[PDB]
Design a binder for this molecule. Structure first.
Ligand SMILES: Nc1nc2c(c(=O)[nH]1)N[C@H]1C(S)=C(S)[C@@H](COP(=O)(O)OP(=O)(O)OC[C@H]3O[C@@H](n4cnc5c(=O)[nH]c(N)nc54)[C@H](O)[C@@H]3O)O[C@H]1N2
Ligand SMILES: Nc1nc2c(c(=O)[nH]1)N[C@H]1C(S)=C(S)[C@@H](COP(=O)(O)OP(=O)(O)OC[C@H]3O[C@@H](n4cnc5c(=O)[nH]c(N)nc54)[C@H](O)[C@@H]3O)O[C@H]1N2
Ligand code: SF4
Ligand code: SF4
Ligand code: SF4
Ligand code: SF4
Ligand SMILES: [S]
Ligand SMILES: [W+6]
Lengths: 214, 963
């Protein structure tokens, strides 16, 4: 099926991906306050499937290393969230045979909300405290099934967001890692063989986010 | 099929925010009969390839927004409430105010009894956000009413850029275009934060880096741009000319210049007169009384014919290149490193990287937007950028140029339509009170005796004649010329500009203001003064998308409606995606866009509002009489409408122009009514009209060239990304200006691998050649009188060579280059209670005053509140922790903001004292949202620069306290 290659060595934190996700699904905006960061919304939620996380790491000499992480579901080849939800009820979490999309259905209102979150190594799922429905990045699967790019990929002007067949994307991810290493020697791939959203990190993924890798 | 888009009409549009000019696809419900259901990028568009930054991606939320104005609103003098009212009321009542104020105030002759035919009782602001056809219509409507005080956004980036680049190259325009960035071998970003302010530009900047380019960011602050460059070099505010001058010395001393390019395409060989000198930081001919220069003392030595003398051997010690060398010898690495705060090794690195592009087969480009080019030597700052590019042969070439980034989607086009006080459309000057006749007007155009100098500006009388025909085709140009108003010749040109309009308002010297697609209550420096001063207006016409801090100043903070006597009309205009027209991007790409949904509620296109309003003024004058009606009465407006209403297509065609009678011209036959093919075929004798000679070529008999969506490219075009068949750019689809400099005198490219043009089969192939003629027969800079790229530019107020004069008044007392500290042709207080340097700038997610983006929930989500960025060093000294509320204060006012403590700000060492900078966005305002904060322009002084008419927004003294 399909794979995202996300080259974080090209991200400007323009946050087009963040707005493009909400425009496409017509999601509402959260109530936000600035608390000493550009980062907002501060975390993933029921109504926010993607937010760009900002971390500042000091460096010897001028400026900083400003790390950006547009966070989304990894669409794992072997979804731990499915394994967990299939306990209470099958169908609440399904896989798309053709694309690789792990998809939450309306029947997540039956499973244990917090159970399916804990099972997720990347801490992705979020609950609606009213309806009990679980939400996350659905991979814009309907767009993909119609031969369109996911909104976040189409909107990205930098070449950070990349999408297509897992064969092509793993070739790209490997070839680009070799190129990016020349500038950022600590560049690595986020769990290339487990997931369908492969992030290129310019250094230790943990510097970007606590749950950047499993 | 996608249910969302299934029953929707798909139209194409261009982004309504920044001058990158990204393509949109719009989906409109009921197959076009109802509302937009989706807006995202146009994947076929060659600039953005369907990518949008969060401002473009949010345009659905801008359009389908319940907070948008629905109908005209009225505020009666001393009322604390809007009264919703009909279009027909508002427009009739506005036309009355116009006629009343015009009749009362109209001057037929100044004190010197010279003909002016104007009113100084009404000023207009705006707007870079309107369509080109609305901009053109508007400027001619105001001038038919006799306004002279016509300004907009452009003033703040025009006053520096246009004179600097016009002096150096003959035009003030961005030299290249966005896609061309991908062809550069070294990209220097200095006075720009393009990853935030022109985000899609970074597509091509990174494509450059993919092809081996070095990316250099030079900024006081570490931004989202810095994160993605190869070198981030910090620079203290105002230290740019030192930096640029140090680079010129580096290039000359290391002989890294393009020798053949310099010798033949620059004025390097021209002999400067013996009257030219420079000593103690003053040029020759300095008049200490009036702090003015006698520029006549900088003239060239002329030959018998009146052509400047040349020594092609570059021996003569009064050769431009030899004077240049001598001038910049003072700017050594130690002085420059000391004043910039940039390390000697980091300067050497940046200089070596960029001066490497002096290789014929390497191209370096400079990107700058606003930066700090507002002070009295910003024009000189940009001059130095031009001179560096001339030395390295980077002008006229793929991946080169001075990329002076424009701001708003159509600021390029709104300026082209002469919505500045000093220009008619096509950059023909507004005549002064001493240009009594059209012939005298024409007599000013500089002439050349160099047969190798095209000196294209000699064609002006054709353009002025055709412009006057486009307005007044019944009358002879010479006669029509007595209709439009003139400015006082015996008066400072800045007296008519942005900053002095605020002065004259606060002196109550204006009855009426049009604030048309602008938000001066927030955009103006010293907002507290500008808001007070709006009380001294009699009437106000605000045209915008939402109620705002300008429409509703009368119920502002610490205001009492009952005491305020200003009659306000608010007229709601429709959004970009609800009308048809063209916008001119930074690359001069003139792009046609279509309506998706019908205008929301009772909102009208600006074209309709201004045409309807003028129609009332007209019928009023037709039935009441009053002051000099001919210019209003006789104005050709039937060419501006179909089916009762404003026709963007027809206005566009008139702007292109057509033959009024059968004419032979250029050596070709033309039938009456033929669209004019190009400005080459306009006439001075009334045969031709053309609203704007730059648009001649844009809408021909071939059809609307701005509406082309064709990606056909020859191999040589596609290699550098010209896209000649995608829309149309002025002049006549030349995408890279000065491209004749990109080839030798045989017509062979300096770099065949990135050729722009080429002599093949006895014609020019690739780009449209910037000036006709065989290789080695014409000087390449065709709008320059002499035809050369100016290293030495003796038209400049501050001197023919850029020289460091300290832009920071308060914290600096030492100039290491001369004993002249401040600009010798230019009174801050520097109250010790305000010891830190305030600076304002932008974030990716918000637009201008935030009038637009504060109404878009998704953008407010990402950036909800005014913040204050400070170093850890200042945070420590003032006891400020990250996220704390802070008060930021100055002599002009005070506000609250959320503290951001970050290493992205650092102290600068100035004369052994650590100087702290505090950073604020100016995106916020009191009206929206709840807890957003107000404009950072409460803190900024109205004390802007005397040699520009431009405010101080990058360096103003503040205090910051914890709350
Ligand atoms: N997101 C967004 N994009 C915009 C706009 C917007 O409001 N929001 N506005 C548009 C408009 S109207 C314009 S004019 C352009 C302007 O675009 P820019 O000029 O990029 O705008 P700023 O961020 O105000 O200033 C650019 C940079 O100059 C730096 N700087 C400050 N002082 C100095 C100095 O003395 N020297 C040097 N070398 N650099 C200095 C600042 O730190 C800042 O990073 O952007 C346009 N694009
Ligand atoms: N402190 C500080 N002040 C600054 C600056 C700074 O950096 N710092 N930047 C300066 C600069 S470079 C600039 S350009 C100015 C800009 O300042 P303004 O021009 O006052 O900016 P806005 O009005 O916020 O933005 C453009 C306006 O266009 C309107 N608009 C959009 N579409 C349409 C349309 O179709 N029709 C009409 N009629 N209106 C429309 C929007 O509603 C908005 O009100 O501000 C200047 N002020
Ligand atoms: S759109 Fe692309 S460049 Fe912008 S924040 Fe998202 S991933 Fe980064
Ligand atoms: S990242 Fe988490 S939510 Fe997404 S598929 Fe993997 S386990 Fe499920
Ligand atoms: S793939 Fe679709 S749902 Fe997932 S983050 Fe991107 S835009 Fe949002
Ligand atoms: S704001 Fe500028 S860069 Fe962003 S989508 Fe609009 S035109 Fe493109
Ligand atoms: S602008
Ligand atoms: W601007």
């Amino acid at each position: 099926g399909k794979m995202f290659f996300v080259d974080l060595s090209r991200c400007t934190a323009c946050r087009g991906c963040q707005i493009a996700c909400k425009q496409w699904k017509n999601l509402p905006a959260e109530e936000t306050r600035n608390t000493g960061s550009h980062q907002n919304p501060p975390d993933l939620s029921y109504v926010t499937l993607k937010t760009v996380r900002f971390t500042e790491k000091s460096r010897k000499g001028p400026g900083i290393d400003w790390l950006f992480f547009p966070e989304q579901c990894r669409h794992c080849v072997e979804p731990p969230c499915k394994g967990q939800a299939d306990v209470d009820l099958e169908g609440a979490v399904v896989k798309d045979e053709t694309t690789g999309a792990v998809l939450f259905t309306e029947l997540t209102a039956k499973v244990d909300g917090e159970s399916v979150r804990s099972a997720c190594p990347y801490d992705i799922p979020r609950i609606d405290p009213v309806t009990k429905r679980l939400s996350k990045c659905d991979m814009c699967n309907d767009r993909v099934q119609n031969g369109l790019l996911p909104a976040c990929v189409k909107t990205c002007p930098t070449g950070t967001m990349n999408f297509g067949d897992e064969q092509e994307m793993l070739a790209l991810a490997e070839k680009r890692l070799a190129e990016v290493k020349k500038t950022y020697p600590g560049a690595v791939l986020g769990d290339p063989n487990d997931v369908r959203v492969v992030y290129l990190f310019t250094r230790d993924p943990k510097d970007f986010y606590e749950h950047a890798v499993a | 099929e996608l249910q969302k888009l299934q029953w929707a009409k798909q139209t194409t549009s261009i982004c309504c925010y920044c001058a990158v000019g990204c393509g949109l696809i719009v989906h409109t419900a009921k197959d076009g009969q109802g509302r937009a259901v989706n807006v995202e990028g146009d994947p076929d568009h060659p600039i953005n390839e369907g990518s949008l930054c969060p401002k473009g991606a949010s345009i659905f939320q801008l359009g389908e927004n319940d907070q948008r104005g629905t109908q005209p609103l009225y505020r009666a003098p001393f009322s604390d409430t809007w009264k919703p009212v009909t279009w027909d009321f508002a427009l009739t009542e506005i036309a009355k105010r116009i006629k009343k104020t015009r009749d009362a105030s109209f001057t037929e002759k100044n004190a010197a009894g010279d003909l002016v035919n104007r009113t100084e009782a009404i000023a207009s602001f705006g707007s870079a956000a309107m369509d080109n056809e609305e901009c053109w219509a508007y400027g001619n409507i105001l001038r038919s009413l006799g306004l002279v005080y016509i300004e907009h956004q452009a003033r703040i980036x025009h006053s520096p850029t246009v004179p600097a680049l016009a002096e150096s190259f003959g035009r003030g325009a961005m030299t290249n275009h966005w896609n061309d960035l991908a062809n550069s071998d070294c990209i220097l970003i200095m006075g720009s934060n393009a990853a935030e302010n022109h985000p899609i530009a970074f597509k091509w900047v990174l494509r450059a880096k993919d092809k081996g380019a070095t990316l250099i960011h030079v900024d006081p602050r570490f931004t989202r741009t810095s994160a993605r460059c190869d070198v981030y070099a910090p620079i203290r505010s105002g230290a740019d000319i030192p930096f640029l001058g140090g680079l010129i010395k580096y290039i000359l001393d290391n002989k890294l210049y393009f020798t053949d390019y310099v010798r033949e395409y620059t004025n390097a060989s021209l002999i400067v007169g013996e009257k030219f000198s420079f000593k103690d930081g003053l040029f020759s001919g300095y008049d200490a009384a009036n702090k003015k220069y006698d520029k006549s003392m900088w003239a060239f030595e002329l030959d018998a014919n009146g052509v400047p003398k040349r020594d092609p051997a570059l021996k003569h010690p009064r050769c431009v290149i030899n004077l240049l060398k001598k001038h910049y010898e003072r700017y050594n690495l130690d002085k420059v490193a000391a004043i910039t705060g940039t390390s000697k090794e980091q300067l050497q690195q940046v200089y070596k990287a960029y001066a490497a592009t002096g290789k014929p087969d390497k191209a370096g480009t400079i990107m700058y937007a606003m930066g700090w080019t507002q002070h009295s030597v910003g024009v000189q700052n940009i001059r130095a950028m031009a001179m560096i590019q001339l030395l390295l042969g980077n002008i006229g070439v793929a991946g080169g140029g001075v990329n002076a980034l424009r701001g708003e989607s159509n600021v390029q086009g709104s300026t082209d339509q002469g919505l500045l006080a000093h220009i008619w459309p096509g950059y023909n000057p507004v005549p002064n009170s001493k240009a009594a006749t059209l012939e005298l007007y024409n007599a000013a155009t500089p002439q050349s005796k160099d047969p190798m100098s095209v000196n294209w500006w000699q064609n002006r009388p054709k353009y002025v004649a055709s412009y006057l025909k486009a307005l007044y085709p019944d009358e002879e140009p010479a006669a029509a010329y007595d209709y439009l108003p003139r400015i006082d010749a015996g008066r400072k040109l800045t007296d008519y500009f942005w900053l002095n309009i605020f002065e004259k308002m606060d002196k109550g010297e204006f009855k009426g203001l049009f604030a048309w697609g602008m938000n001066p209550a927030c955009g103006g420096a010293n907002a507290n003064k500008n808001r007070k001063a709006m009380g001294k207006l009699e009437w106000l016409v605000n045209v915008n998308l939402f109620e705002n801090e300008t429409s509703s100043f009368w119920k502002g903070p610490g205001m009492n409606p009952a005491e305020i006597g200003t009659e306000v009309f608010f007229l709601p205009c429709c959004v970009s995606i609800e009308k048809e027209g063209s916008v001119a991007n930074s690359g001069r790409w003139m792009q046609w866009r279509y309506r998706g949904p019908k205008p929301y509620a009772e909102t009208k296109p600006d074209g309709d509002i201004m045409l309807d309003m003028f129609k009332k003024v007209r019928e009023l004058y037709a039935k009441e009489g009053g002051a000099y009606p001919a210019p209003i009465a006789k104005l050709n407006i039937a060419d501006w409408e179909e089916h009762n209403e404003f026709s963007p297509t027809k206005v566009a065609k008139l702007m292109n122009g057509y033959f009024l009678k059968d004419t032979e011209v250029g050596g070709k036959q033309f039938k009456k009514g033929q669209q004019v093919p190009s400005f080459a075929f306009l006439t001075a004798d009334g045969s031709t009209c053309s609203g704007n000679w730059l648009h001649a070529g844009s809408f021909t008999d071939a059809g609307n060239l701005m509406a082309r969506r064709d990606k056909t490219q020859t191999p040589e075009q596609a290699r550098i990304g010209l896209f000649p068949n995608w829309s149309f750019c002025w002049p006549v689809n030349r995408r890279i200006l000065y491209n004749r400099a990109s080839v030798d005198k045989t017509g062979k490219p300096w770099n065949p691998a990135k050729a722009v043009i080429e002599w093949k089969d006895g014609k020019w192939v690739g780009d449209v050649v910037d000036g006709g003629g065989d290789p080695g027969t014409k000087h390449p800079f065709i709008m320059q009188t002499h035809g050369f790229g100016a290293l030495y530019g003796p038209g400049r107020e501050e001197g023919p060579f850029p020289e460091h004069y300290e832009p920071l008044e308060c914290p600096v007392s030492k100039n290491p280059f001369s004993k002249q500290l401040h600009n010798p042709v230019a009174k801050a207080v520097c109250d010790p209670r305000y010891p830190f340097i305030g600076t304002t700038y932008r974030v990716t997610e918000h637009w201008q005053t935030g009038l637009m983006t504060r109404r878009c929930a998704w953008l407010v989500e990402a950036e909800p509140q005014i913040f204050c960025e400070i170093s850890k060093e200042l945070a420590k000294l003032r006891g400020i922790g990250n996220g704390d509320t802070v008060k930021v204060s100055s002599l002009r006012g005070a506000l609250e903001a959320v503290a951001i403590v970050t290493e992205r700000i650092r102290p600068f060492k100035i004369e052994g004292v650590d100087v702290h900078m505090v950073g604020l966005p100016w995106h916020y305002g009191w009206m929206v949202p709840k807890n957003g904060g107000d404009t950072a322009n409460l803190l900024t002084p109205s004390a802007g620069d005397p040699n520009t008419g431009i405010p101080e927004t990058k360096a103003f003294m503040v205090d910051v306290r914890k709350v």
